Amino acid sequence: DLKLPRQKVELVAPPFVHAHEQATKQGPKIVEFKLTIEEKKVVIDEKGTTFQAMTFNGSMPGPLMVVHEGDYVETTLVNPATNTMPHNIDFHSATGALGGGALTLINPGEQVVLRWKATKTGVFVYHCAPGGPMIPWHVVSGMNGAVMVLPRDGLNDGKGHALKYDKVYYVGEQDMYVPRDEKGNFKSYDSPGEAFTDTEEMMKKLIPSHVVFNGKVGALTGKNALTANVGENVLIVHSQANRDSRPHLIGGHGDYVWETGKFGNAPEVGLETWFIRGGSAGAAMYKFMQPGIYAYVTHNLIEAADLGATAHFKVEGKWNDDLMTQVKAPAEIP
């Protein structure tokens, strides 16, 4: 019926992204992906707070899927019998049936296969959306990720010049709502079902207890810091499925930024801080000019420093004293 070549993709866990071409001479293909839902209790902070998570492929965020404009994305969604709830998937990149959600509702023990054509370029959120009050709950429990649909000629600056990245990372930000008991300690639950009543009362007050990248406080730091070298052009894809974020690379800039995340629009240049609308993904690229540590944060600094929303980059290379120099080191006031 639809007679195109098929290509399988092996998804990798964020913040890494599966191998792909930017500009390509391939024509349209059916690109095949598989997502398996996992409900699990996880640790979200350095004090040992636990959380009833619901995930695609066992990670928060779900993995980034990368295709090109005109491809057909065929996803097998699997809800094993070890889960307790029905789940589905909705792609903001897709057209019709509530983004696919109306065609993908599966009980524990079932799977479904959905195909959608990638007619719109950019980065887009996907998330679970089973219906009614379950929709927010599933999403803030971790069931969201993103897809990137590239132009076949790769990215451009709007002003006919190509924009090629040397690497891409995917930072998924997650607002989490963990209730406290009378003592003021965070509560733990035996199942997602049991967490629901207390969690929903807290959610409706709209203030998260934690805001984290890659599912945990400190996930993208120390040994798991993002890396680059001076001279490298890095693309950072940032998603937030429920709540606004304001990304900022401390010590750097957004050289080229698509804050609404859609490549039919020219990027903005030379930003300090950009804005990711809740329910969207955006993308920023920067060429590193200096070595050392950078922090990538949401620039509500309370959220960054106290609620979990800080990642690090470690950058190698030579210090440029023309760009910045300590003229005189700390010394007593004359």
Add this chain to the structure above:
Amino acid sequence: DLKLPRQKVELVAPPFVHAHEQATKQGPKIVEFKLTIEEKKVVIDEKGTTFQAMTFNGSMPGPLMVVHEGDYVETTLVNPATNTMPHNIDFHSATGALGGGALTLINPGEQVVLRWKATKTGVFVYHCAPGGPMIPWHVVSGMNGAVMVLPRDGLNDGKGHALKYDKVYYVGEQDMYVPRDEKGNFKSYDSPGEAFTDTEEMMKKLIPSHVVFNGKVGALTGKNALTANVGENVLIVHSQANRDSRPHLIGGHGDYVWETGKFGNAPEVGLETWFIRGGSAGAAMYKFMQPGIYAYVTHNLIEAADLGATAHFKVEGKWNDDLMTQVKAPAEIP
């Protein structure tokens, strides 16, 4: 003095918009509108919660006024003796006197006539603004709507091509602050005056109890769903007079979006989610490609699913399997 032709407009209740031309060969006219203030107790949710509303023309939002660049808008504002408070009107589209507010303060029993020239194209908020602490209270009680000022040549994509809509809807989003008693039930009041003290304490904490389109949970659903057909280009005008919103059409896109709402700027293309700044209106147009149900939401999903901010479209036409198809229906895992 000002010797131009006069044209009366009969306003219609949102989400409908009074009949108007897009591109027009008419020159400037004085366009005449009348707004009558109504204070009333209304029901805002399916559990029967009540609210002391203050409205233009008896609706939340007030009706959309549509004119063209260079027109003169002459508004008669009427505050009948059955109301209890002074009221006025401020147009963000207008220049001078706090948008008209400083020239339109009227006690119960009075009316006033204001004229302003429409020098700026786009969609703009209007709202009551009597002075001091009353300003937020009147606005979050429902006294806000919007005006659309069209270019005389109609809308364009910035890239010399015309953008004609087949229909336009106006979705006004309202953040509401209903206090709870010691039990945890929503309180009811006999008058706006009596609601004021409890309402103001809640407002200053910045978290709404409800966020609704067209004045009530479920207002734009079921029999009152928005409608379209595959192939129709629909313009959705969205306003929020006090608090940010992030509109999203589930299963669709914003083909052409003016998120800051001003037609001197080219629209952005192919958005998933857009951002309406508190105190502004924006506009998005989409051509439907698939039939079925779509939800139009703010993509803070807690607000959408739990606080009231969801509308529906029912779209007629033929399903397009090239864009999306269920390859295999729900089935047991092999």
Add this chain to the structure above:
Amino acid sequence: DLKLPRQKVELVAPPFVHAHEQATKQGPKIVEFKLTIEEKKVVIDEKGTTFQAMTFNGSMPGPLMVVHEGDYVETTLVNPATNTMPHNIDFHSATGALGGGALTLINPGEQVVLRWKATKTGVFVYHCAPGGPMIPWHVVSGMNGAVMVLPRDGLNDGKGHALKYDKVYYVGEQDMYVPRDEKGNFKSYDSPGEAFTDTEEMMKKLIPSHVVFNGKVGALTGKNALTANVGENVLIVHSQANRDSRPHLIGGHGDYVWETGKFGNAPEVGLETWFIRGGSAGAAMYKFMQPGIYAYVTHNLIEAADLGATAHFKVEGKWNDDLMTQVKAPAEIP
């Protein structure tokens, strides 16, 4: 080593800005600035509420520094022995070492000299960032300001036409977190250290007690209103180092707006309300067309009217009845 001419600047307190050229025939210079940190208890509202402030040069916000693209900015930061905490400075305009913060940490009694090259045009935040949980606390205590880096040819509209302002004001917005005691009154503290524990618990709940321009409720009103005349083009630079804002000039517009604040991007035109992302500065220019009072607010009106975020302009000149007129004054309903 770096052999360029040196120029000293005398900083002035906001909302004024030190004298500078827009378009300039000067080449790159080393521009020298000095900032002295002051910790002090201040009054932030008309009821006499006090607050433990931490400031650059004794003001909230810190003063605006103005330079041109390609200049080298050399800042002497001074932390006198009368202060109690270590401090530093981070410039969003600068490249490397966490914006300078990693090179400027000074204990009470010390000073440091940092030089950075201004490679990026626009308005940018600077703020203290000592490390960890101290970062948000220092910033919301008042330790933030902004810098403007102008193109050497001055500003343009993107469409080759020059945009010259007759004056510029700097409005720094500050979200403040003052705890309440059991009575419900605001608490006072003897030192910043003692304020810390209660302040941090409140901060993590993300709702400010006050939102103020220029450090106090009513600071930019009455005798300290901003001024202009009909026909004057005024540039308003607005910063928020931690939390989003949505500026709006009541009775006017943003004729040309850089809401992300970066002059490599063309401005948007004819805005009603614009958006300043937390951790950024933006800039709007407007030519006054009418005399009288204007209010400049964040258009969350609860914040504007009840939490402190309102400034005034008093504009002189002749009223234009073509733009707006009271056709009929308040009168009894026929």
